[PDB]
Write a protein that binds this ligand. Structure first.
Ligand SMILES: [Ca+2]
Lengths: 1137, 138
């Protein structure tokens, strides 16, 4: 369309702009923007300023340049120019800058400075293909929208639910009373949620210290306003720190079932994020469903073919057979290094000079490899060097042929890198690894866009949070954007989803606490990882494609007895009986009574089962049984149960549950997913080996770089972990009038890198994405041997954690993809009347003009629920009563209206109506309960009043249907869930005594006690969530004294009552991991294996609309031609749609 | 309907009447608690509960006479409403139970068997009614 327009000089200047150079200029000056701003962030702290103070003009420089390009834009296409997206955003940013400094000139506030950070996107704006990338990412968001709302729906539904019971608890959380030693009773009148702390007391005063707040000291999380509940629901959805919400609420009445709420919430948020993964993978299958070098190799190899005293060495270029045998010998040489990489490393703090003469052996292996590279040099001279790998290995062996020089011990540490040469083996696996690395070339651009998002978000963050940064009292503050790298590590922090929470509660707390403008700051985090993790989720699809591209590439009488069906029936009654008995034994106290009859029962079942093994054994088993899983399972059932209680621990009663487990084999549905799993582990075992080898690599890295470190003192004020001795002040809060002595120092830092085994230890913890930044930070306090400190010493070390984490972002992410592909092939394997006045009222109601009306009524009820502020004092409460009365009357009235219809079918027919009837019932009942108020359960009834919202979902057509897909999906996978229970149900009991009697205290073991079985179910449930388990693990290595009221032991105490048992948690995380993997594949096969196809159909065909066409078919009969004529109108209408 | 709708409900109804009698005894018992306003209110809740229960029973026998002499969705409608009213009455009994428990806390004295019997009654009514309600869809 353009505007105004003019010839003359304008066309010439535009022709100049049609050239080339200007592009590079604008781009590079944008780069100048990026750099200058990245510096500009350093620092801030309100006023002061330093070097940036001159840059302050320079942004005006960029301004005027860009503005000159705007003068060029005048020559562009005006209104026609607006149509371009990149040009649109560019013009936008231009307006932000013009308005920016244009406001600034009058100033001769900080929001303008925030608007400064908009610039970097222009870097994308100048770059081709990134537009293709982002145009791709936008497409991804659509086939997800429903579920997002569903999340929001839960986020609302739970909120309103939280806006009841938890709002009823909002009456609790907002207040407290207490005194004396922090021993006030929990959850029994006059009780309250406590601040975390290593002690907790909260001076207020309120007698001797108060005792309960969490709306601000814990930060916002309080359920009072609907908004804050929406917040706490976000973080609880994040599967991060939420359990603290639980122990808080539970601290104050009570252990009823808050857990039902948090468990349903966790499990569902889980369910549907898994569904998100399903949507993404569905996009993968969508693109791939239609989507589904030898020449040069022949060239190089045949040139090598024609290519074919020193001449004896030329004979040695091919000779001889020994060169094969020598490879076996070579396996020894690297093996000597395989220990040496540890042996030169082991131990730590100068302990054990294991490399007493190992250096000579290193010189010897260096001599052998040098002899090999030398003979290879004799083999073909320069042609041997033509291959880069040969000269590389030769340069490595020569590097080992060097010397102790020099001062950079990391060069000595490169010997660990020399160990990589041992990875040369493993035939064909390297090719698969090449297939893996090949994907990186594809995903790298998107990774760069991720780097960009990281960049903009980081800078803006720096100019926001760190743009104030300051927070008087009282450490550790951790990362808080005080400097650009700091913001890097912290953005990357919350990006992991690790403990972002505390960051955020430094965030809102930074702006003077919650109010009205400051709380808005929260939005950033909500903008952030919710999109940021989303960006990560987006990354999956890339791999999802690339990886699939690779995929695209008179004994007879007893025989009558055991085989008898009646014997199996007595075995069935025995099954129900033994199950009832073991379930009776599920409580810890059951053994205290007469459990012996149950032992006789389990003995009978073990007898019949071992007899079944005896029956199968006589019929061509043995070696077949050695091959077959089942008969081997029964024979192993025979031998393992026979293991003595003496010598190596065992407990036969725990095996009593196992005897009926064989019946699970009779189910076939589990066998498909299971066969899929056994097919899966074989499919990607090499990757697992690669990961473990990475564990070795980073192990060797950390050990010969950190071993002297971490032997921390208290605090930094001691440095030398030997200079440490005696007491040490601790000032509570900040005031230098509240001293408390402590026999402090030293500290083992929980996870030494003194040992490569310990390296496997801690490195696994960071592998969990759980608790690492603490380890990171203290790693940054490192220096020399026995010393910590300080602040931000040795920042370069921080680079390392990230690097490894980045690799975790690869293969782990690959792992989950792998399963899916087999399943995708597995799915392919799976593919292999009315009358009188009633006639009048029915006509009026059936018209469903009321539908929009009733809908509006419901939404207004929603807003009435939004009214729920529990500040002070009354007035509005009575109004709320009146409102609830209003809606309940309107609704019950409406149900009466519907009652005035089919009646015999209106009371049922279509099921939701019945549900509505339920609603009316609970509504009226609760109302009467309100009348009787002139009682605690009435809250649980008001829940029913909240349940009305679901009716909105009833109106949510082409959305609830997806939930119906979830419903049809729901059944088949449930069989696995029993094992999902059983995996706990075993280990819990298996732990229930072992880790039992660990004493309640205040460690990681208080309201989170291991005591009764159900609580054990919880403490093993946290581990499922990746919720700070390692601390709990740390508690269990030696623990405390008994339950400090139990049988204890004797005079013995001294926390001696617990001992090493890392294996339990460690193994359990993995078992839980694999079991959950099974949960993935189960959900997938039972749903998206159909449901993704359902997305493909609903997005294109009309299989779903056809049901609506049948609904049109309802308004008819059953023939004949007259029915065809009456339906001809609706038919002629339908086909157009 | 279906024959299983008779045979399965044939099982649940026994627990239903059982918990019904258990409830009748639960109210009737003078051994509500050993004795070494909110109580009255909870008693009223028990009244509405039992009333809802008897109404549900009328709905049930009505459902039987209906299914005997009508299609099904009518009789099934009578049943579902019965499971419903019995359910809400059951939950109401749970409410009166918890309320009486808390009132007991307000109060020597000791717990009596009639109370827990009422609790198991309400439980049986809860699962049972949940089943009969579940039976309606299928
Ligand atoms: Ca976590």
């Amino acid at each position: 369309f353009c505007l105004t327009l003019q010839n003359p000089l304008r066309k010439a200047c535009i022709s100049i702009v049609e050239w080339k150079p200007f592009e590079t200029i604008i781009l590079l000056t944008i780069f100048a923007n990026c750099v200058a701003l990245a510096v500009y962030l350093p620092m801030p702290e309100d006023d002061n300023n330093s070097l940036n103070l001159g840059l302050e003009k320079l942004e005006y420089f960029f301004l005027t340049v860009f503005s000159i390009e705007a003068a060029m834009k005048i020559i562009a296409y005006g209104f026609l120019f607006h149509q371009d997206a990149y040009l649109r955003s560019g013009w936008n940013v231009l307006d932000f800058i013009i308005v920016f400094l244009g406001v600034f000139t009058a100033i001769l506030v900080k929001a303008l400075r925030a608007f400064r950070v908009l610039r970097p996107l222009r870097l994308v704006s100048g770059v081709p293909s990134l537009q293709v990338v982002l145009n791709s990412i936008f497409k991804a968001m659509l086939p997800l929208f429903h579920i997002a709302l569903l999340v929001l729906f839960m986020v609302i539904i739970y909120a309103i639910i939280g806006l009841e019971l938890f709002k009823g608890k909002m009456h609790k959380t907002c207040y407290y009373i207490g005194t004396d030693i922090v021993a006030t009773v929990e959850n029994e009148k006059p009780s309250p949620c406590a601040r975390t702390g290593s002690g907790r007391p909260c001076t207020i005063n309120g007698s001797e210290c108060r005792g309960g707040w969490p709306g601000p000291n814990h930060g916002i999380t309080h359920f009072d306003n609907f908004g804050f509940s929406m917040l706490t629901v976000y973080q609880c959805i994040t599967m991060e720190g939420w359990t603290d919400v639980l122990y808080w609420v539970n601290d104050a009445i009570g252990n009823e079932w808050p857990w039902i709420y948090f468990v349903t919430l966790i499990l569902l948020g889980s369910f549907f994020i898994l569904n998100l993964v399903l949507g993404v993978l569905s996009g993968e299958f969508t693109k791939e469903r239609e989507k589904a070098q030898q020449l040069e190799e022949d060239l190089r190899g045949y040139m090598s073919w024609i290519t074919q005293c020193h001449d004896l060495v030329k004979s040695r270029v091919f000779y001889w057979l020994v060169i094969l045998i020598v490879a076996l010998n070579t396996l020894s040489i690297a093996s000597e290094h395989h220990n040496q990489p540890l042996w030169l490393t082991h131990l730590q703090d100068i302990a054990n000079r294991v490399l007493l003469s190992l250096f000579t052996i290193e010189m010897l292996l260096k001599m052998y490899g040098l002899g090999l590279r030398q003979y290879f040099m004799s083999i073909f001279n320069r042609f041997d060097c033509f291959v880069v790998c040969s000269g590389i290995l030769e340069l490595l062996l020569v590097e080992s042929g060097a010397m102790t020089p020099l001062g950079i011990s990391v060069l000595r540490c490169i010997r660990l890198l020399r160990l990589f040469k041992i990875t040369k083996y493993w035939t064909s696996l390297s090719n698969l690894v090449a297939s893996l690395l090949n994907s990186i070339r594809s995903i790298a651009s998107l990774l760069l866009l991720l780097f960009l998002f990281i960049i903009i978000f980081a800078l803006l963050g720096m100019q926001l949070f760190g743009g104030r940064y300051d927070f008087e009292d009282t450490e550790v503050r951790r990362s808080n954007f005080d400097n650009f790298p700091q913001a890097l590590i912290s953005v990357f922090q919350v990006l992991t989803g690790e403990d972002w929470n505390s960051v955020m509660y430094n965030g809102i707390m930074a702006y003077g606490g919650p109010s009205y403008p400051g709380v808005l700051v929260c939005i950033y985090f909500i903008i952030l990882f919710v999109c940021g993790n989303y960006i990560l989720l987006n990354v999956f699809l890339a791999i999802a494609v690339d990886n699939l591209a690779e995929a695209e590439s008179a004994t007879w009488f007893t025989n009558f007895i055991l085989l008898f069906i009646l014997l199996s029936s007595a075995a069935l009654a025995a099954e129900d009986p033994i199950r009832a008995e073991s379930v009776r034994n599920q409580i810890l106290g059951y053994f205290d009574i007469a459990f012996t009859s149950v032992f006789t029962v389990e003995i009978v079942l073990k007898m019949t089962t071992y007899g079944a093994f005896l029956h199968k054994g006589s019929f061509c088993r043995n070696y077949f049984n050695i091959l077959d899983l089942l008969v081997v399972a029964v024979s192993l059932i025979s031998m393992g149960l026979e293991s003595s209680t003496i010598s190596v621990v065992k407990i036969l009663r725990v095996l009593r549950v196992l005897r009926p487990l064989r019946a699970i084999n009779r189910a076939k549905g589990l066998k498909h997913v299971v066969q899929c799993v056994f097919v899966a582990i074989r499919t990607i075992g090499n990757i697992v080996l690669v990961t473990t080898l990475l564990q070795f690599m980073f192990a060797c890295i950390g050990v010969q770089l950190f071993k002297g470190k971490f032997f921390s003192c208290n605090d930094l004020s001691k440095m030398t972990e030997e200079e440490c001795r005696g007491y040490y002040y601790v000032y509570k809060d900040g005031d230098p009038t509240q001293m408390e002595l402590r026999p402090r120092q030293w500290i083992h830092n929980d996870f030494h890198f003194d040992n490569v085994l310990s390296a496997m230890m801690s490195l696994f913890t960071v592998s969990t994405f759980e608790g690492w930044p603490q380890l990171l930070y203290r790693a940054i306090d490192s220096n020399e041997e026995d010393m910590g400190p300080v602040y931000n010493n040795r920042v370069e070390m921080a680079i390392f954690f990230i690097i490894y984490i980045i690799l975790i972002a690869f293969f782990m992410m690959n792992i989950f993809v792998g399963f899916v592909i087999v399943t995708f092939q597995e799915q392919g394997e799976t593919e292999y009347p009315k009358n009188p006045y009633q006639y009048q009222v029915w006509y009026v109601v059936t018209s469903s003009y009321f539908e929009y009306l009733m809908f509006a009524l419901i939404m207004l009820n929603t807003i009435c629920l939004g009214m729920q502020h529990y500040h002070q004092s009354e007035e509005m409460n009575h109004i709320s009563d009146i409102l609830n009365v209003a809606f309940t009357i309107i609704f019950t009235l409406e149900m009466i209206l519907k009652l005035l219809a089919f009646k015999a079918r209106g009371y049922f027919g279509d099921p939701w109506n019945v549900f509505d009837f339920l609603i009316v019932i609970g509504s009226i009942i609760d109302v009467i309960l309100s009348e009787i108020d002139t009682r605690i359960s009435s809250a649980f009834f008001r829940l029913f009043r909240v349940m009305r919202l679901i009716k909105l979902l009833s109106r949510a057509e082409g959305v609830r249907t997806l939930l119906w897909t979830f419903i049809k999906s729901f059944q088949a996978l449930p069989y696995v869930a029993l094992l999902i229970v059983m995996l706990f149900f075993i280990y819990a009991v298996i732990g229930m005594q072992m880790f039992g009697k660990i004493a309640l205290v205040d460690g990681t073991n208080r309201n989170n006690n291991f005591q009764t079985f159900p609580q054990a179910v919880l403490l093993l449930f946290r581990c499922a969530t990746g919720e700070a388990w390692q601390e709990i693990l740390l508690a269990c290595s030696y623990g405390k004294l008994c339950d400090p009221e139990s049988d204890y032991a004797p005079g013995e105490e001294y926390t001696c009552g617990t001992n090493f048992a890392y294996y339990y948690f460690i193994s359990f995380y993995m078992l839980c991991a694999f079991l959950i993997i099974n949960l993935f594949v189960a959900v997938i096969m039972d749903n998206f294996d159909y449901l993704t196809r359902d997305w493909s159909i609903l997005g294109x065909x009309x299989x779903x609309x056809x049901x609506x066409x049948x609904x049109x078919x309802x308004x008819x009969x059953x023939x004949x031609x007259x029915x065809x004529x009456x339906x001809x109108x609706x038919x002629x209408x339908x086909x157009x749609x | 309907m279906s024959p299983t709708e008779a045979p399965k409900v044939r099982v649940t109804l026994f627990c239903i009447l059982v918990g019904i009698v258990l409830a009748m005894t639960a109210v009737v018992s003078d051994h509500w608690a050993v004795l070494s306003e909110f109580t009255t209110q909870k008693e009223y809740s028990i009244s509405a509960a039992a009333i809802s229960v008897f109404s549900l029973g009328f709905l049930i026998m009505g459902t039987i006479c209906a299914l005997m002499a009508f299609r099904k969705k009518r009789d099934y409608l009578l049943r579902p409403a019965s499971m419903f009213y019995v359910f809400a009455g059951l939950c109401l009994f749970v409410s009166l139970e918890v309320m009486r428990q808390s009132v007991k806390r307000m109060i020597y004295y000791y717990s009596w068997s009639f109370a827990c019997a009422c609790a198991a009654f309400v439980l049986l009514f809860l699962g049972g009614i949940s089943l009969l309600l579940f039976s309606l869809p299928r």
